Amino acid sequence: STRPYPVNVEAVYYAPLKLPIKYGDLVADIQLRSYDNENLDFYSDFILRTGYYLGIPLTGPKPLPTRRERWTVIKSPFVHAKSKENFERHTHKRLIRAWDTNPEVLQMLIAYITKHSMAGVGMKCNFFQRSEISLDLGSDANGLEKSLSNIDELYSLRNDDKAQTSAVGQKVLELLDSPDFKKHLE
Amino acid sequence: TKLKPTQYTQLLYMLNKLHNIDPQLTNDEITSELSQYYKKIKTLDEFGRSIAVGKRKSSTAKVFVVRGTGEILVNGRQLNDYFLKMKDRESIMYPLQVIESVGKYNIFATTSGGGPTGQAESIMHAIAKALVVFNPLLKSRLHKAGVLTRDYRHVERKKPGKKKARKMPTWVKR
Amino acid sequence: SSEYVLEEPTPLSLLEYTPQVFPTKESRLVNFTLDSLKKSNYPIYRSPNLGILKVHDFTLNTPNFGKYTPGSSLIFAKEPQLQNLLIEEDPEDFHRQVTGEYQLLKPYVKKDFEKLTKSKDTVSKLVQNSQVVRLSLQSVVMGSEEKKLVYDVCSGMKPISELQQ
Amino acid sequence: SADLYMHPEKWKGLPPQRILELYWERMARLGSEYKPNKDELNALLTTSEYSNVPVNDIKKLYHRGEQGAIDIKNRDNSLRPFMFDELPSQAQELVAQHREQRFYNRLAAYELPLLAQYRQEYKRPSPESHPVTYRYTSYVGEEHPNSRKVVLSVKTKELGLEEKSLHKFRILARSRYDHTTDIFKMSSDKFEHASQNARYLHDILQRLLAESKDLTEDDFSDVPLDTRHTIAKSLRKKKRDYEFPEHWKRPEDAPKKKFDIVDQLLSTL
Amino acid sequence: NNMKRMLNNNNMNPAGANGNINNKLQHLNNMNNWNTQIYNYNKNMEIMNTMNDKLINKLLYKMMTLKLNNMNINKIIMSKTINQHSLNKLNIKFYYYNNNNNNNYYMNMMNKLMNIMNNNMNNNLCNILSYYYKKKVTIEPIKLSYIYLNSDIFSKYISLNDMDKYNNGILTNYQRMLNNIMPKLNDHNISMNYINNINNINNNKYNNMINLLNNNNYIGNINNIYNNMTIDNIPMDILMYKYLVGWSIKFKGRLSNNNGRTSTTNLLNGTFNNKKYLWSNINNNYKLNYIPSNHNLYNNSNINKNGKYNIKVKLNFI
Amino acid sequence: GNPDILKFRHLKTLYPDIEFVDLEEQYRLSMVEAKKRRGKGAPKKMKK
Amino acid sequence: QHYDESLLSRYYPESLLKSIKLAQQTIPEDTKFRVSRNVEFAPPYLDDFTKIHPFWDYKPGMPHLHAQEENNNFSIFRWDQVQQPLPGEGNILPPGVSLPKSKSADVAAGLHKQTGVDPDYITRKLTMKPLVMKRVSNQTGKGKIASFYALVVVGDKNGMVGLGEGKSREEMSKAIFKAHWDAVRNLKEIPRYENRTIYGDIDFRYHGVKLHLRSAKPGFGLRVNHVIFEICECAGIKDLSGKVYKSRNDMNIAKGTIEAFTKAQKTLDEVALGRGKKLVDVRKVYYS
RNA sequence: GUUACAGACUUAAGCAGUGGAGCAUGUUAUUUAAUUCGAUAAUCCACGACUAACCUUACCAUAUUUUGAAUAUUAUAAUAAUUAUAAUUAUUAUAUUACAGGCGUUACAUUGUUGUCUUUAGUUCGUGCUGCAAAGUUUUAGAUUAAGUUCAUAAACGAACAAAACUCCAUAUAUAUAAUUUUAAUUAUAUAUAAUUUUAUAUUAUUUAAUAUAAAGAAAGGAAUUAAGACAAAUCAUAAUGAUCCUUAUAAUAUGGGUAAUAGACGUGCUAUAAUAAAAUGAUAAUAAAAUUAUAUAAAAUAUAUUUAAUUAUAUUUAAUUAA
Ligand SMILES: [Mg+2]
Ligand SMILES: [Mg+2]
Ligand SMILES: [Mg+2]
Ligand SMILES: [Mg+2]
Ligand SMILES: [Mg+2]
Ligand SMILES: [Mg+2]
Ligand SMILES: [Mg+2]
Ligand SMILES: [Mg+2]
Ligand SMILES: [Mg+2]
Ligand SMILES: [Mg+2]
Ligand SMILES: [Mg+2]
Ligand SMILES: [Mg+2]
Ligand SMILES: [Mg+2]
Ligand SMILES: [Mg+2]
Ligand SMILES: [Mg+2]
Ligand SMILES: [Mg+2]
Ligand SMILES: [Mg+2]
Ligand SMILES: [Mg+2]
Ligand SMILES: [Mg+2]
Ligand SMILES: [Mg+2]
Ligand SMILES: [Mg+2]
Ligand SMILES: [Mg+2]
Ligand SMILES: [Mg+2]
Ligand SMILES: [Mg+2]
Ligand SMILES: [Mg+2]
């Protein structure tokens, strides 16, 4: 009815898109635990959606088996031990796995997820770093400087058009920049 | 809420008789009045064998049944080696025995979970389902024999006060 | 009934929310900095103290906050402002976190043991005992100086009395 | 500006509602440390035409809060009958859930596309150069003591070793080296931080490699590979090694493609 | 056949017809059965958090009662708090009751209390809580205009405020007022109407799908699928619980000055069965696997001169 | 638990403006007063 | 469906346009878009989320989970009124309901529904009077179960009178209402000489009570048992003498006296018709 | 200390037991400085107590604490945080009373909760009608069901708490997801659909209802829920509170002892009294499920008991994982 609903709205209304996996280089897997479903499933869906945009090829909520912590108790405060009541608690577990991403993008995703987290859901992340066999923390000061430069590049304000800002993050950046911080090691 | 069964039966009787009027002689008015009161297939694989999964107690049996001469392999080994009790073997055979097709079909069973007798029963169940695909006309016969029924008999849990499911601890009067 | 004011997401807004343990070197430095800020009692997880309220500038992060053994009640110490606030930022902590430096203790040599005790077999036994202790203490987590003291006590280089202080 | 309530001197020229809002803000921000102001009072007096209150009365109210109001002036209306203008508890909870859902939908629509700006193509490190995989774990909201756990894991054939040295390395590894999958892994939880633990693991690996490449008066050519731990592990697990016999297959008995004429007609592309 | 297949693939709607689901306006999230909405991987930490939450609840209860120069003691009733533990942040929340444009110019005691919760820049209660949890806390009060919309509040209020009306015996007027809170709603009629509305909605969506249709299961554009479906029409009809159908309130204990014995006194109104679940696709669900979702039960036990007593309340909400 | 937790004492420290009422304490005080009145108050403690 | 930028700007605000463009860039034109059956992310109605709703979205300045504001900034400093009132129409009234002497009017309305009686007449001209107001009980297995019994004469003061009894386990007001209802259902035209007294000296037995009611000269008032008096006031009898013998059970008096009025009385005209004679009233003829 | 019918683990079959033996455990009694207190017909007796060495413990002996665990009031003094050498606050110290504290006594003062009647089918409200009325009818003449659930009949017509149903587990099917190295896809988990099963031919009794037969189906259970009332049933020893009593003691801490004493008795169990039943052995390790492992689970392997070795038990030392 002459009202152009763009593609993002359409995507929201439908199921979440998933990018295909080029190589099986499991970068990170994220397990989501909760004592119920509805929130957890929603959260997983949201994670998938954000992963799509950050192009991360996320697989999807593979349900790992639910736990069951049972506990029985005599109903009465005193005696009547023949009458007993049970209690249970189901730890519902879902798995996400990111498949191909440059670390920074993955970090951003994870940071975004934890920012807009839901009520009942706990989270655990296993990150995987394919490093070479031999390593060196000898050529140090230069490597530190490079790392600082990379950080600066990452956290640069491109256009201040009322974007999201954090005071703590700004402070951290300022600390990283400082001469005292550079001095630390030597 | 004021509708009674007897009233409904009467209504049905009235409708049915009207409907029964020979379709050629029926009217438009009658039909208008009566208008108010109206209202996946299994196949063989690439290699020509019918997969089927059966269950009993804790057991699960995925069974590949194929048209080659009748030999058995339960869980990657010989039938007499796996099932020591002859009863279990007889049970397994029974779907092929109700049909005259023991010797016709090669069977490759793969079980998991439960104990031996339950596993054998699950295999049998799977085999019947597999057979049903080869000839759908025998399905009714298999059902009659009592092989197509999934045996529901599930182990009852231990209830709190009771020792086992039903076994209660001793009662005393004095 | 109003327009949705879209504030754009940025890496800076998602800073703080970065994982505390992430492989990257850049991330590690950031995490360390965040930890140092937390130690300093910077306003993270809370609204800041500025020059508006004067009397009610209270904090709960005192030297022994959620702890019993120091005999007191809840101590409402005054917070600094955002100006006039120091950050701890210690070198040892940096070494632990950013780089992967660890102390490992020192293995006690036989010569040191010979200084105290006379017989050779006894010295060798003492050395063995010290070695055994060392690996166990490496495995355990306690405290840099305290652990070293314990190790010394176990060896016999220091007496039992130095623990009870 | 945001810092406006703090300065009562500036707001006389504003509208009355706005002035009231500023006053309320001021009262809120410094609750116990509130201290009346002349300019603020004047503003409040000016506003008085907005909400029907006399000039003396407003001033009195400003001076004395609830006591003044009481002086200026009730029946209990707790069980007054329902006028149908407010949802119950469950209802309100359901509404809140729905609000949350809507918020998340909005985020998905307009913030996640923005997030796609910060997007990089995968820069793969080759398995030839980067065989080792240090896996780190992090519990997000919590402070688990397993966050320190780091796990190195390498295929032994991917390590740059000669055949004699490789065998020696495997022998040294003992339980850490699995032989079915040619994989050697080890985890360290000894140190406080994760990075420390990773460094320690790396150092161990390096030491192991150095030992493997020694060969001076220590070969280990005549100590066969101990595979007891691996067989124990295999026993603990179950196996599905068996397969369908290949000579039992019947491709001739398989269901042939059934001729669908309308589908064929349709397929003009 | 293709069209039918496409429909089957896309056939979803709000539950409650006779391909459907219970939407977030049609049932409670089971997380809203518990009061500490949390999962942590270290269970010790989780336990510590739930202890903290419980302690904060008591503190909040204590705060809720104010004084005004020893003249008036306005006892603000509050619900049991519900603590939402996201990864980022805690959020505490509670429902509360409080009993001409002259009050634009002074802050009420209740207002001041509410301001203290989040608005006092450095000094606020949320800030102080944040030290106990190591994450940003947000207390949200929600005002209820009636006493009987929340069960806990209803029971609590009667326990605290209306002592005199039942201490010797339930006064007649008070009992009458309790009886005639709600206007005796035909719950059967309402449930049936709701079901009919749901059916109509389903038909509308189906009709739209048909219109669009005139191996891939994509229909037309969103505007044409949800042709007549809007925020003005659907949400409020779909909203499940809205109408206090039936309620029971029990006073129990030593509520008799002459008598030494106890006195169970029960007021009953409406009905506690729900007829939306009886003849439709929507099914009843059980909170903590023992309380029908629609029900909400609570009690509060104030001490008297004679000794202890309590006040059970139980509402139904269609 | 965490021994440093907010108490009613502090709710006077943090928010002096709001005249709070601890109900249980008040009740206890009233009971004590009643006991004193009807000759059932606590006996005066020995010092020695 | 990939729309142009200008078209988007026409319908959508300037803030979200960039985000839309990005979404278009990322998501291809050839897209399947599956329907997630096992979980529903989006709502059951179509909505472009550009407009924040007052009721159905979170209130902007209010604090909550998913606040997206600083710990200092929360624009909400008055908690006297409710924050999020109900959208569109203020009410949530079901179909066929309404918002809240009155009791008498309600009775009259109910009578009009049940038995087609004029409500206005019931409200105005009829005036009621309780005669007996017992509390009454039954020994049930649960226990002694009390019940409020009323007995309430109603009557237009022009010879139209009715007795009625009613009962409620709940408090006496309900019982009285029921009695009133019953009375109005049982309205009855009593005959009376000169619109002031009964015709003859009646002597009537109702169960226990033996009634004796003498006629009266005008001005001589009601000189009878209190129940009888009450009934007469409602039934328009100005002048009456009489005395109750045997039982003086209030209820039975009330029942007996109206029965006597309706039944024991004969109007002069009726008597004349029966006998075929003139039956003159001498005083009337005289003109006093 | 009454009629009459109907019901089920009531009885009857049947299978295994108790009652005899020894041991375990609870109880009794008696003993003891103390054997802490309660539960003590069904509805106590491996019950409160899902672990009594110390602790827990409440009991006893001997020691030693006296505003003590709190809250408030009134004063002196000391330290630390914040500000631009002073001050504001927060705390601590020493005291100062009101008190705090009490597993002391009364569940025959209470709360909440529980047991038994009870998953038994009962327990009541509007309007109408009957009776002067308290009341009755509804809520039953029949019958049937597991059933106040239902059809037949009826001055009744509707309506609630129970019943049933929705619920959970388990089952069958479908869809989704899992790059089939966290794999068990023979799986797990979200979302549906499915039955309190349906249809037809006959044979008995009166359009239906039981039996039988047939064809259609994976279609067959368990759990939770145990109403009103009653038993002054159980609990003041989960906890709280009324009244009452103790306040250098009936409150508080330590060291040891006791709760484990033993004539007879009473329950619950365990192990037995041998061949339709016991023991050795069984590594291409016959076949499970459910659940636990950051107050840990402890693999392989070495050493000793033990000439081979395996088994079993310890020690040595921690590989792996905080977990499909
Ligand atoms: Mg009558
Ligand atoms: Mg028997
Ligand atoms: Mg004997
Ligand atoms: Mg014996
Ligand atoms: Mg006692
Ligand atoms: Mg005893
Ligand atoms: Mg002791
Ligand atoms: Mg006391
Ligand atoms: Mg004691
Ligand atoms: Mg009790
Ligand atoms: Mg007792
Ligand atoms: Mg009856
Ligand atoms: Mg009866
Ligand atoms: Mg039921
Ligand atoms: Mg598999
Ligand atoms: Mg009962
Ligand atoms: Mg008793
Ligand atoms: Mg009792
Ligand atoms: Mg007591
Ligand atoms: Mg106590
Ligand atoms: Mg003592
Ligand atoms: Mg004992
Ligand atoms: Mg027992
Ligand atoms: Mg034997
Ligand atoms: Mg071993």
Phi, psi of B89 (to 5 degrees): -65, -45
Nearest protein residue, CA measured to C1' of H17: B170
| E64 membership: H or E segment, kind and range | helix E43-64
Show the beta-strand stretches assigned E in chain A.
Answer: 28-34, 62-64, 69-74, 84-89, 92-98, 121-131
Chain H bases near protein Cβ (<7 Å): 38-39, 41-50, 66-68, 70-72, 80-84, 88-93, 96-101, 109-116, 123-129, 132-136, 150-152, 157-162, 164-168, 170-179, 181-193, 207-208, 215-225, 228-230, 232, 234-235, 237-248, 267-269, 285-292, 294-295, 299-301, 317-324
Distance CA D228, CA D179 (A): 10
What Cα–Cα distance (Å) separates residue G40 from each residue in A2, C82, E24?
27, 45, 9
State both tokens at C70: 């120091």
DSSP character at residue G130: E
Give the residue carrying structure tokens 């920012």.
Answer: A115
Note the residue count of chain B: 174
Contact: E127, C56; criterion CB under 8 Å: no
Q: Half-sphere exposure of residue A67, counting CA atoms within 13 Å on the CB side?
A: 12
Please give the C-alpha separations between residue D25 and each of C50, C53, C161, E143, E219, in angstroms, as whole numbers: 17, 14, 62, 20, 52
Tell me the β-bridge partners of B64.
Answer: B51, B108
Query: Which pairs from F36-42 meet CB under 8 Å and 24+ separation?
Result: none
Classify each residue of B86-118 as buried b or exposed e, where b means 16 or more C-beta atoms within 10 Å of its C-beta: eebbebbbbbbebbebeeebbbbbbbeebeebb
Q: How far is CA B123 from CA B89, B96, B111, in A?
A: 10, 12, 7
Contact E34 A1 (CB under 8 A): no
From the CA of B86, how many Å to the nearest CA of chain A? Answer: 37
What whole-number distance in Å separates Cα of residue C52 and Cα of residue E121?
Answer: 9
Integer Cα distance of G227 and G253 in angstroms:
7
Using DSSP, state whether C62 is helix, strand or coil.
coil
H58 C1' – F26 CA distance, angstroms?
31
- Identify the H or E element spanning E79: none
**How far apart are the C-alpha atoms of G243 and G259, rounded to whole Å?**
16
A96 vs A82: CA distance, rounded Å: 46
Chains B and F touch (3+ CB pairs under 8 A): no
CB contact under 8 A, C4 and D110: yes
**D98 near C CB under 8 A:** no
Joined together, the tokens standing for residue B124 give 């049998």
Give A125's contacts in chain D (Cβ within 8 Å).
Answer: 137-140
Which is nearest to B74 in space by CA: B95, B57, B56, B93?
A: B93
* φ, ψ of residue A83 in degrees (nearest 5): -85, 120
Interface contact D67-E235, CB threshold 8 A: no
Alpha-carbon distance C22 to D139, whole Å? 11
Strands B72-74 and B59-66 come out as: unpaired
Which chain E residue has its CA at the smallest distance from A4's CA?
E223
CA distance E54 to E42: 19
Q: How far apart are CA E274 and CA E245, in angstroms?
A: 9
Distance, in Å, from the CA atom of B33 to the CA atom of B25, rounded to the nearest integer, reads 16
* Closest CA–CA distance from residue E173 to any residue of chain D (Å): 11
Written in H, E and C, the secondary structure of chain B is CCCCHHHHHHHHHHHHHHHHCCCCCCCHHHHHHHHCCCCCCCCCCCCCEEEEEEEECCEEEEEEEECCCCCEEECCECHHHHCCCHHHHHHHHHHHHHCCCCCCCEEEEEEECCCHHHHHHHHHHHHHHHHHHHCHHHHHHHHHHCCCCCCCCCCCCCCCCCCCCCCCCCCCCC
List of residues 6+ apart from A138 with CB closer than 8 A: none
Kindly report the number of other CB atoms within 10 A of residue C153's CB atom: 16
A92 close to A64: Cβ distance less than 8 angstroms: no
CA of D240 relative to ligand 15 center, distance in Å: 9
Distance from CA(B160) to C1'(H44), angstroms, rounded: 20
Candidates B124, D102, A59, E286; CA nearest to G53 is: D102
Nearest CA in chain G to E84: G65
Tokens of A16: 């979440």
Give contacts of D31 with chain F, Cβ < 8 Å: 15, 17-18
Nearest to residue E102, comparing CAs of C15, D68, B135? D68
Within chain C, residue ranges assigned H as helices are 11-14, 25-40, 91-97, 110-116, 120-139, 144-155
Q: Are E221 and G1 in contact (CB under 8 A)?
A: yes
- CA B165 / ligand 4 centre spacing (Å): 28
Sign for the CA dihedral angle at C24, C26, C31, C36 comes to: positive
Tell me what percent of chain D is helix, strand and coil, each rounded to the nearest 5. 45, 10, 50
**φ, ψ at E192 (rounded to 5°):** -60, -45
d(C-alpha F22, C-alpha E60), whole Å: 11
Look at residue E36 and give its three-state secondary structure.
strand
Q: How was this structure determined?
A: cryo-EM
Chain C hits for D140, Cβ within 8 Å:
19
Q: How far is CA D104 from CA A45, D51, D220, G43, in A?
A: 10, 39, 62, 11
Between CA E150 and CA E154 the distance in angstroms is 6
Structure tokens at D28: 């809120």
Under a CB-based contact definition with an 8 Å cutoff, are residues G227 and G131 in contact? yes
Contact with chain B for residue D251, Cβ under 8 A? yes
Distance CA(G138)–CA(G145), nearest Å, equals 5
Q: What is the nearest nucleotide to B119, using C1' and CA?
A: H287
Question: Ligand 1 centre from G215 Cα, in Å?
Answer: 28
Three-class SS state of D164: helix
- Say if CB G138 and CB G144 are below 8 A apart: yes
Cα(D95)–Cα(G55) distance, integer angstroms: 9
C96 contacts on D by Cβ (under 8 Å):
192-193, 195-196
Tokens encoding C65: 């906050």
